[PDB]
């Protein structure tokens, strides 16, 4: 076992799991889900004594809410069995335990509803509504909604009740930023886009509205059920180990077409 030395002792035997997922979405103008997947990693940070037999249990459905892995690679320390149990003697400190992909039953934490109105050929009226879709006790953090503007843009007027927004002319986008937002809510932004005149013939190819966010759950639906520690020499049971998990779900590509 060349990934863990043999001397290791801690009074405080503790581990931390980070489930880190990036959720990706392409949505049609009329709310259809054109494409969506999650990529995830589980990172373990183990401060455990001796050489212990860890067993990682999740809400895998092949084994309540239960979920569907398309595929995954593991860290060499993992004993490949097909009971679908995850067994290993972990390296010390921090390492990547598994990497995975999911396409089915994904929680899309945000819904984006765009509305666009042409006003002659002098301006565009734009309304965008975002809906948080997740437990109300949970807050999303670091929410950005990026609304692209045409190249013939004289100037931009925006109102929003939540957040701050700026027209960023060099980037050709309005950028709305919200610090915090809770589950099962709505917010909207209105903007009026002043146009320059332009070659009437070439039309605007409206790129998507994209979002960034971070959420404290796994959009795949993954929940950690247990992490079991057995060290058969040393005199500490499983229930002596202090165990922690956190979830950090972040947008990848998360685009809604208008």
């Amino acid at each position: 076992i060349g990934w863990r030395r043999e001397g290791i002792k801690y009074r405080r035997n503790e581990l931390f799991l980070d489930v880190l997922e990036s959720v990706n979405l392409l949505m049609s103008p009329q709310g259809q889900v054109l494409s969506a997947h999650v990529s995830g990693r589980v990172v373990m940070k183990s401060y455990l004594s001796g050489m212990p037999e860890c067993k990682f249990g999740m809400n895998d459905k092949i084994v309540k809410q239960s979920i569907a892995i398309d595929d995954c690679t593991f860290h060499q320390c993992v004993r490949l069995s097909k009971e679908r149990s995850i067994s290993f003697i972990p390296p010390d400190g921090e390492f990547e335990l598994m990497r995975y992909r999911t396409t089915k039953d994904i929680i899309l934490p945000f819904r984006v509803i765009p509305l666009v109105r042409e006003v002659g050929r002098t301006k565009l009226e734009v309304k965008v509504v975002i809906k948080s879709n997740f437990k109300p006790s949970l807050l999303a953090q670091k929410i950005e909604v990026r609304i692209p503007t045409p190249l013939n843009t004289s100037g931009v007027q925006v109102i929003c009740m939540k957040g701050k927004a700026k027209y960023k002319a060099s980037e050709n986008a309005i950028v709305w930023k919200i610090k915090r937002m809770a589950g099962m809510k709505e917010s909207q932004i209105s903007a009026e886009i002043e146009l320059l005149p332009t070659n009437d013939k070439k039309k605007w190819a409206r790129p998507p509205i994209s979002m960034n966010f971070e959420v404290p759950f796994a959009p795949s639906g993954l929940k950690v059920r247990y992490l079991k520690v057995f060290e058969p020499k040393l005199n500490y049971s499983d229930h002596d180990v202090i165990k922690w998990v956190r979830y950090i779900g972040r947008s990848g590509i998360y685009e809604t077409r208008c």
Binding site: V224, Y226, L227, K243, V245, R246
Partner: peptide, 6 residues
């Protein structure tokens, strides 16, 4: 943000 595994 870290919670106990129950």
């Amino acid at each position: 943000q870290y919670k106990s595994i129950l």
